[PDB]
Design a protein around this motif. Structure first.
Motif, PDB file in Angstrom:
ATOM      1  N   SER A  83       0.821  -1.205   0.000  1.00 49.01           N
ATOM      2  CA  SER A  83       0.000   0.000   0.000  1.00 49.01           C
ATOM      3  C   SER A  83       0.857   1.259   0.000  1.00 49.01           C
ATOM      4  O   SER A  83       0.518   2.248  -0.656  1.00 49.01           O
ATOM      5  CB  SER A  83      -0.938  -0.010   1.204  1.00 49.01           C
ATOM      6  N   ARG A 119       7.183   5.120   3.797  1.00 50.31           N
ATOM      7  CA  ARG A 119       7.576   4.549   2.512  1.00 50.31           C
ATOM      8  C   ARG A 119       9.059   4.198   2.491  1.00 50.31           C
ATOM      9  O   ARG A 119       9.452   3.161   1.943  1.00 50.31           O
ATOM     10  CB  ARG A 119       7.245   5.520   1.382  1.00 50.31           C
ATOM     11  N   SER A 128       2.628   1.587  -3.549  1.00 53.01           N
ATOM     12  CA  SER A 128       1.775   1.989  -4.664  1.00 53.01           C
ATOM     13  C   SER A 128       1.268   3.413  -4.436  1.00 53.01           C
ATOM     14  O   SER A 128       0.222   3.659  -3.833  1.00 53.01           O
ATOM     15  CB  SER A 128       0.632   0.996  -4.840  1.00 53.01           C
ATOM     16  N   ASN A 129       2.051   4.366  -4.941  1.00 53.59           N
ATOM     17  CA  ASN A 129       1.709   5.783  -4.869  1.00 53.59           C
ATOM     18  C   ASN A 129       1.362   6.356  -6.239  1.00 53.59           C
ATOM     19  O   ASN A 129       0.328   7.014  -6.387  1.00 53.59           O
ATOM     20  CB  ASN A 129       2.866   6.575  -4.254  1.00 53.59           C
ATOM     21  N   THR A 130       2.221   6.113  -7.236  1.00 51.56           N
ATOM     22  CA  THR A 130       2.107   6.616  -8.612  1.00 51.56           C
ATOM     23  C   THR A 130       2.010   8.148  -8.638  1.00 51.56           C
ATOM     24  O   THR A 130       1.117   8.739  -9.250  1.00 51.56           O
ATOM     25  CB  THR A 130       0.930   5.967  -9.358  1.00 51.56           C
ATOM     26  N   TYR A 131       2.981   8.762  -7.946  1.00 56.32           N
ATOM     27  CA  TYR A 131       3.184  10.216  -7.903  1.00 56.32           C
ATOM     28  C   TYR A 131       1.943  10.957  -7.399  1.00 56.32           C
ATOM     29  O   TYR A 131       1.550  11.996  -7.932  1.00 56.32           O
ATOM     30  CB  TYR A 131       3.622  10.754  -9.270  1.00 56.32           C
ATOM     31  N   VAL A 132       1.322  10.408  -6.359  1.00 55.98           N
ATOM     32  CA  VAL A 132       0.149  11.028  -5.758  1.00 55.98           C
ATOM     33  C   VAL A 132       0.405  11.554  -4.352  1.00 55.98           C
ATOM     34  O   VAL A 132       0.068  12.717  -4.072  1.00 55.98           O
ATOM     35  CB  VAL A 132      -1.046  10.049  -5.753  1.00 55.98           C
ATOM     36  N   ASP A 133       1.029  10.780  -3.473  1.00 60.39           N
ATOM     37  CA  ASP A 133       1.268  11.168  -2.090  1.00 60.39           C
ATOM     38  C   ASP A 133       2.632  11.854  -1.998  1.00 60.39           C
ATOM     39  O   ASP A 133       3.254  12.184  -3.012  1.00 60.39           O
ATOM     40  CB  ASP A 133       1.162   9.950  -1.168  1.00 60.39           C
TER      41      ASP A 133
END
Lengths: 49, 49
Positions: free
Chosen positions: A30, A47, A33-38
């Motif tokens: 969890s 992380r 898996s960010n994909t440049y969001v958080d």
């Protein structure tokens, strides 16, 4: 009276294997898996851990 | 198939002490606490002792 002999031999390979395990946690996936969001300053430490 | 294992341990401090005694006789206290009253030739030797 003797004659010299020739010996003919043959061998076959044998197949083996190795196995090693590798676990990962649910929170690890969890956090990974960010994909440049958080990117807040508290989730980044988790992380990195 | 086996997977790697991590361990965590926590140890705490434990408090001890040392004690040593030291006595002064009341005569020596009376010698040392004259507060500028003595100073003759025989009180000086007792104060030194």
């Amino acid at each position: 009276v003797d004659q010299p002999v020739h010996n003919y031999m043959v061998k076959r390979i044998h197949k083996r294997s190795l196995s090693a395990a590798f676990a990962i946690a649910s929170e690890a996936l969890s956090l990974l898996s960010n994909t440049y969001v958080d990117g807040t300053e508290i989730d980044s430490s988790l992380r990195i851990r």
